[PDB]
Design a protein around this ligand. Structure first.
Ligand SMILES: *[C@H](C)C1/C(=C/c2[nH]c(/C=C3N=C(/C=C4\NC(=O)C(CC)=C4C)C(C)=C\3CCC(=O)O)c(CCC(=O)O)c2C)NC(=O)C1C
Ligand SMILES: *[C@H](C)C1/C(=C/c2[nH]c(/C=C3N=C(/C=C4\NC(=O)C(CC)=C4C)C(C)=C\3CCC(=O)O)c(CCC(=O)O)c2C)NC(=O)C1C
Ligand SMILES: *[C@H](C)C1/C(=C/c2[nH]c(/C=C3N=C(/C=C4\NC(=O)C(CC)=C4C)C(C)=C\3CCC(=O)O)c(CCC(=O)O)c2C)NC(=O)C1C
Ligand SMILES: *[C@H](C)[C@H]1/C(=C/c2[nH]c(/C=C3N=C(/C=C4\NC(=O)C(CC)=C4C)C(C)=C\3CCC(=O)O)c(CCC(=O)O)c2C)NC(=O)[C@@H]1C
Ligand SMILES: *[C@H](C)[C@H]1/C(=C/c2[nH]c(/C=C3N=C(/C=C4\NC(=O)C(CC)=C4C)C(C)=C\3CCC(=O)O)c(CCC(=O)O)c2C)NC(=O)[C@@H]1C
Ligand SMILES: *[C@H](C)[C@H]1/C(=C/c2[nH]c(/C=C3N=C(/C=C4\NC(=O)C(CC)=C4C)C(C)=C\3CCC(=O)O)c(CCC(=O)O)c2C)NC(=O)[C@@H]1C
Ligand SMILES: *[C@H](C)[C@H]1/C(=C/c2[nH]c(/C=C3N=C(/C=C4\NC(=O)C(CC)=C4C)C(C)=C\3CCC(=O)O)c(CCC(=O)O)c2C)NC(=O)[C@@H]1C
Ligand SMILES: *[C@H](C)[C@H]1/C(=C/c2[nH]c(/C=C3N=C(/C=C4\NC(=O)C(CC)=C4C)C(C)=C\3CCC(=O)O)c(CCC(=O)O)c2C)NC(=O)[C@@H]1C
Ligand SMILES: *[C@H](C)[C@H]1/C(=C/c2[nH]c(/C=C3N=C(/C=C4\NC(=O)C(CC)=C4C)C(C)=C\3CCC(=O)O)c(CCC(=O)O)c2C)NC(=O)[C@@H]1C
Lengths: 172, 162, 162, 172, 162, 172
């Protein structure tokens, strides 16, 4: 498993060189916005249950055929499995905003996921739609101007939105 | 590799839950101490090769049996001196990475994992490596917060060899 | 899924032997009680949708907080009433399948497996589902052997929710 | 695992409908011939050891080259393995006559069987011949007019013969 | 298969080390006794079929119930006699292999593995096989070191059947 | 697992015949040179640590790029893994000189080795070079005229050199 600091160390080791001026500075930039990064990691965690629950409610509305009889997700076992999987994606996107690196989401979550869904009969484009809705629902909560010191956390929203996009392009 | 950020995420993932209150403060603790670690790696970046060239010359004065021995496996030849600066430079480079990381991780995977097996296989004495690492610890000339982060990881490498 | 025929075959296969004397009588027992179960599913086939439309109206009279609440997650809207007949119809349909089977199997996989996780996730109260299921139990108007098979599986669903 | 009753339930659920008049009737027909079905399940079980033992004796006669040196089935370990495998097929055909469905034979017996034999050097056409002989030996015992109330159990013999045929087309 | 050479190599591999002092002497022991085993297999090569044809005739005199019984599963027919010499020849052939090997291995895999399951399945009595194997043991007419190696493996087959 | 004696037995069984005059004689020839065979099995074992240690020192000299940063074998974990793997090949070549058969080296060492190295990023031509150096280093020690009764053990050196060659053609 790798974090943002250890990603650049693994690259620095592969060329047998110490970190350069630009490599220490771009990493010092992460320590500089770390307070805002941890605010994002807290907001997604606190509203975890809420983000996955509503993204589902929106997905069933967008694709009703999928969740009722004859669809890939009918039965209580399946409805729970879908919410669980959406809760997994979110939990790993949260781990990625913390690490600053995407290896955690990649290694133990997204690996043979497209293959799992293909072998199970689960769509993929419907899981991508679910992840996309979780993105929209996560950006509202994470960038809420209320109850926080006012500032700019744009590069965090861009990065957070990219991590959801990476999780959707892996199932579609 | 083991970084406090990774350590918390691994522990969290094991329980299948998000980060606990205790784990988050451990992570908030990484960032409040990270600046000194990055400034430590900046000292190593600019003067690490220079400290390695001096540490190699120190062992040829502390332990005389290295430079007066045979040719196929010892530091008598000028090629062996080039491998001694290289090895010490690899060690210092890996310690710099530990400060950038805020943990033992780079030393754990790059040097500690399979250390005793290799030295015992290639007739290398850890006595030489501890000796040249005790030198650069007392010769670096670093401040305090940046020096604390440098000393923590140099003395973890010394603990791993002894 | 769990049917007495499957239950015996699974147990037999585990031991790597054919059906025991005890297991065969358990299977011969399924067929001596099967006719009443198929006739139970025939009552549900013809009047199950009608019992579901009435059970949905019963909960709007037993629990007033469902029809007077908000729009994004409650039964105030005419679309929510359509989902309430649908859910109750899914339950009754699955109970009919249990009679055709002679076991808990259809309820086990289709509704009991992951029931408490889903309701707790979508803000659904089992209180509403038990209420509408207690209605159709006392309103179906079934005989005896066909009624015994109907009551066994309606009260397994009520035991699974409470 | 599925039985005849649960096969039609899984189909009924997939279209979100209760069982139709014809679906309850064709299933009531199974309860009607169930006494004769269980007579078949008893006769194959009682004469289990006898059916597999004789089908083997006939197979070695039909294909002697296979069981003596240089053949795929020489050595005591292999001769026992062949009888065991033939005992497995029979046991699962018996489970299929009971369930009225073939899922049990299919799921945990016939699945990667053609692949197992290909990777082991075992023929397949010789295993099919063995299963075919077990069929002929099973139909004589199962439809024996003696010691039973006289009647018609044709649809049971047809179905029982089909289950052996399904087990042979899976190895050939 | 189990040969003393294989037995030592398997045990060594389990420990992930080379052969121990104890294991090497066990292997040096194989070669000091191997010549007598190869000369044993030379006696069997030249007169094994002849000993099998006589052993088959011995059982038709020790146990009368084999030649006077039915046709589909007994030794009454001239085809059954051909299978009796064949089976006894397979046994003697496998015992010769055991001497060439210096261990129980060929008997272990070719005849002992799944012996009792097969005989109990095909109505074969081990009583006949022990009887014809006790014959060729007392009729072979072998020396001593070559006879010791022949007797060890014939009496392992008799121990495996009884 | 098979030895030289059991290789010919497995072949003899497959044709349902006892060992022929030539088969007992070629095997008696192995018992005749067995004293010299066990001298080889002792010399490789005693100088085990020495043969793998020096073959490595020669490989790093031949291919320095491979062992320093950016190479497939940098880090202490990897340098130890390389010596361990070279120690494995040697240990299995030693087992092959003892058994007189190559099945042990083949079955539990060389099987999916080319596939392991391909999936790990380890060269193969560099592992072959390492095995080749172990061969040259093994032939000097194994055929040392000192401390041994003087004689001819050519067929042993030829066979021993072939076992290293078989282990190299399996990774290259
Ligand atoms: C300097 C303290 C002295 C000198 C050291 C020396 N070491 C070797 C052997 C090797 N050292 C390494 C270095 C590393 N590879 C790694 O992956 C890591 C972890 C980051 C390290 C430190 C390697 C790869 C080798 C073997 C390959 C090589 O020959 O370079 C030697 C070579 C002598 C030999 O073959 O035994 C030397 C000279 N020697 C001294 O005596 C010192 C005091
Ligand atoms: C009627 C008792 C009332 C009504 C029920 C209600 N439930 C939901 C949410 C869902 N219910 C289901 C139904 C099932 N899917 C299955 O696989 C099974 C097992 C056979 C069942 C019973 C599903 C799939 C959902 C979610 C998808 C959907 O929106 O339909 C709602 C939707 C409201 C919400 O989003 O929370 C409603 C209205 N509501 C009441 O208050 C009743 C008393
Ligand atoms: C001679 C002692 C008598 C004779 C023996 C007999 N055995 C069978 C049945 C079989 N025996 C074998 C032989 C082997 N196959 C192996 O792999 C091994 C291990 C090396 C052995 C020994 C086999 C394959 C069979 C079954 C196939 C076949 O029919 O040959 C029979 C056949 C009678 C039957 O079908 O039951 C016979 C006649 N019979 C006696 O009564 C003897 C005293
Ligand atoms: C919901 C958006 C969609 C959906 C999801 C769905 N998932 C499953 C079952 C599985 N999901 C996974 C994935 C993971 N399991 C893990 O532990 C992890 C973390 C490492 C991941 C990423 C796996 C492995 C399974 C199978 C094992 C299991 O059952 O838990 C199902 C069930 C498929 C079925 O039909 O049985 C479904 C349906 N289904 C949808 O329709 C939505 C689009
Ligand atoms: C961007 C998402 C939004 C935003 C964030 C923002 N955060 C800060 C600074 C701080 N955040 C914390 C809070 C914590 N994170 C933790 O993990 C913990 C431990 C439980 C705490 C307490 C803290 C302590 C700070 C610093 C002090 C403070 O609260 O001001 C800022 C201020 C700028 C800075 O980085 O110092 C901002 C702006 N601002 C937005 O507009 C977005 C909605
Ligand atoms: C006899 C008609 C033919 C024959 C059969 C034969 N089978 C094996 C070994 C195996 N058979 C199976 C199949 C199953 N094992 C199971 O547990 C089940 C139920 C789920 C099945 C269907 C498997 C997996 C094996 C391998 C494992 C084992 O050894 O038990 C062999 C041995 C192959 C060999 O040469 O070693 C043989 C020979 N062989 C014939 O010649 C007949 C045509
Ligand atoms: C078709 C294979 C042959 C045939 C069968 C046949 N069976 C019956 C009816 C019965 N069979 C049983 C026997 C049992 N099966 C069990 O599992 C158990 C429990 C151990 C028992 C006792 C019973 C009890 C009956 C019913 C009463 C009876 O014996 O008559 C029939 C009669 C028709 C019917 O279904 O009622 C028949 C004809 N008849 C044939 O000709 C085939 C050889
Ligand atoms: C040294 C000559 C070269 C080299 C070798 C190297 N090996 C590994 C790791 C593995 N090697 C094996 C092979 C075996 N493991 C066994 O237990 C056995 C006996 C049955 C064999 C044959 C395996 C399975 C591994 C992976 C598991 C493990 O780590 O032990 C590595 C590590 C690869 C990496 O980059 O992580 C290397 C490097 N590498 C070289 O550059 C030399 C050419
Ligand atoms: C070929 C590699 C070299 C060579 C060998 C050679 N060996 C012998 C004979 C013997 N070797 C042993 C030694 C042992 N091997 C063991 O495993 C053990 C148990 C620990 C021992 C003691 C023995 C006992 C002998 C026989 C007596 C003796 O030492 O002479 C010979 C002699 C010929 C023969 O086979 O009898 C030779 C020549 N000779 C070479 O020139 C190669 C360098």
């Amino acid at each position: 498993m790798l974090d943002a600091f250890s990603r650049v160390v693994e690259q620095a080791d592969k060329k047998g060189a110490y970190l350069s001026n630009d490599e220490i500075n771009a990493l010092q930039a992460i320590v500089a916005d770390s307070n805002k990064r941890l605010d994002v990691v807290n907001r997604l965690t606190s509203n975890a249950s809420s983000i996955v629950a509503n993204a589902y409610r929106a997905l069933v509305a967008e694709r009703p055929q999928v969740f009722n009889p004859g669809g890939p997700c009918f039965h209580h076992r399946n409805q729970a499995a879908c919410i669980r999987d959406l809760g997994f994606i979110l939990r790993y996107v949260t781990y990625s905003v913390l690490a600053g690196d995407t290896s955690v989401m990649d290694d133990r979550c997204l690996n043979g996921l497209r293959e799992t869904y293909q072998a199970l009969g689960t769509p993929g484009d419907a899981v991508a739609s679910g992840i996309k809705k979780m993105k929209e629902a996560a950006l509202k909560i994470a960038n809420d101007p209320n109850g926080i010191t006012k500032g700019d956390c744009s590069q965090l929203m861009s990065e957070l939105a990219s991590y959801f996009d990476r999780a959707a392009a892996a199932v579609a | 590799m083991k970084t406090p950020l990774t350590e918390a995420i691994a522990a969290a993932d094991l329980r299948g839950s998000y980060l606990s209150n205790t784990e988050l403060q451990a992570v908030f603790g990484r960032f409040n101490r990270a600046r000194a670690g990055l400034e430590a790696a900046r000292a190593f970046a600019n003067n690490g090769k220079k400290w390695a060239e001096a540490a190699a010359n120190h062992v040829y004065q502390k332990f005389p049996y290295t430079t007066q021995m045979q040719g196929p496996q010892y530091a008598s030849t000028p090629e062996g001196k080039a491998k001694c600066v290289r090895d010490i430079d690899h060690y210092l480079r890996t310690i710099s990475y530990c400060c950038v990381v805020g943990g033992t991780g780079p030393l754990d995977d790059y040097v500690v994992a399979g250390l005793k097996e290799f030295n015992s296989a290639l007739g290398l004495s850890p006595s030489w490596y501890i000796a040249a690492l005790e030198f650069v610890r007392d010769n670096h000339g670093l401040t305090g917060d940046v020096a604390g982060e440098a000393n923590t990881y140099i003395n973890y490498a010394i603990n791993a060899l002894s």
